[PDB]
Amino acid sequence: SRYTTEFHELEKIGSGEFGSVFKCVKRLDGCIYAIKRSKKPLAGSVDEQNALREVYAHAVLGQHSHVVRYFSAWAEDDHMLIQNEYCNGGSLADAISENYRIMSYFKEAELKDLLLQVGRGLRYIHSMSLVHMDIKPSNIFISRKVMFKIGDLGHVTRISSPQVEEGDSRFLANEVLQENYTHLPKADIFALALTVVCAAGAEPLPRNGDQWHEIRQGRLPRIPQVLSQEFTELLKVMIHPDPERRPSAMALVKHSVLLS
Ligand SMILES: COc1ccccc1-n1c(=O)c2cnc(Nc3ccc(N4CCN(C)CC4)cc3)nc2n1-c1cccc(C(C)(C)O)n1
Numbered sequence: 001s002r003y004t005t006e007f008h009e010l011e012k013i014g015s016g017e018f019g020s021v022f023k024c025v026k027r028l029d030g031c032i033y034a035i036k037r038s039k040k041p042l043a044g045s046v047d048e049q050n051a052l053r054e055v056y057a058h059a060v061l062g063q064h065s066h067v068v069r070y071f072s073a074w075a076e077d078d079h080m081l082i083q084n085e086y087c088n089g090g091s092l093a094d095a096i097s098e099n100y101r102i103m104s105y106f107k108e109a110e111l112k113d114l115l116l117q118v119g120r121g122l123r124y125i126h127s128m129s130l131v132h133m134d135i136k137p138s139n140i141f142i143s144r145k146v147m148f149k150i151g152d153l154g155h156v157t158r159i160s161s162p163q164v165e166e167g168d169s170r171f172l173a174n175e176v177l178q179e180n181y182t183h184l185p186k187a188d189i190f191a192l193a194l195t196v197v198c199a200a201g202a203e204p205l206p207r208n209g210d211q212w213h214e215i216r217q218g219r220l221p222r223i224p225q226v227l228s229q230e231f232t233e234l235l236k237v238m239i240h241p242d243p244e245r246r247p248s249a250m251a252l253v254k255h256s257v258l259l260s
Pocket residue numbers: 012013014015018021034035036068082083084085086087088089090091094138139141151152153
């Protein structure tokens with residue numbers, strides 16, 4: 001087995017329908033990696049389409065400080081293995097749960113740092129004519145200075161010929177639900193604003209109802225902290241009902257509010 005020959009498992013860090021992810025040490029280089037091992041996808045399934053989107057994204061994207069580094073992928077007896085960089089801080093979703101437990105959240109300066117770093121990753125992905133389509137706290141990984149990195153490329157698609165799989169309804173822009181895929185980079189921007197709102201300590205985002213529609217009308221959810229007006233206006237314009245009004249990732253990373 002290449003997996004057992006080249007690596008030693010150190011800690012299970014993920015489990016679910018996607019299979020299992022372990023923190024491993026590679027024997028040859030002594031470095032730590034995150035390795036996902038999953039069953040061969042069933043033909044015609046969403047799992048198969050996600051695996052195809054991920055292989056394409058891994059071949060197209062280069063190394064970027066704010067995208068989880070991809071190293072290798074191989075098959076072992078009807079199981080697929082993917083070796084990525086290990087981010088020692090876990091996901092932003094788990095960092096948010098830990099903050100909730102200690103009655104805390106990311107303060108304003110930390111939220112602007114998160115928004116800018118994830119924005120730099122999105123600038124790179126979008127510059128490669130791709131969209132992520134699944135930005136959310138569980139797909140942002142942390143390396144600890146703190147570095148935020150986008151992970152889980154399974155929903156990555158091409159702007160020129162988009163194939164949009166089911167997204168997380170809590171982070172889904174209205175125009176994507178309407179099957180309008182002409183401004184997909186702006187669906188990533190909308191999801192990023194809601195990811196930052198989660199990091200700010202908001203209540204669990206709704207999946208439907210009056211509250212889901214209220215957010216899609218351009219109204220930010222409540223957060224248990226006061227943010228500056230320059231920052232709140234940036235979050236509010238990122239969820240505008242008109243995607244053309246939301247900032248591009250290029251505009252977002254040049255914003256003096258985040259840079260300062
Ligand atoms: C090989 O990898 C991946 C392959 C596909 C998609 C995403 C990942 N993927 C990365 O690329 C990644 C990089 N770094 C980390 N670091 C980490 C450190 C600690 C923890 N903690 C430990 C302590 N526990 C109490 C809680 C969890 C969790 C993660 N994890 C990673 N991943 C990962 C891990 C779990 C789940 C998932 C998905 C598939 C998204 O569901 N992906």
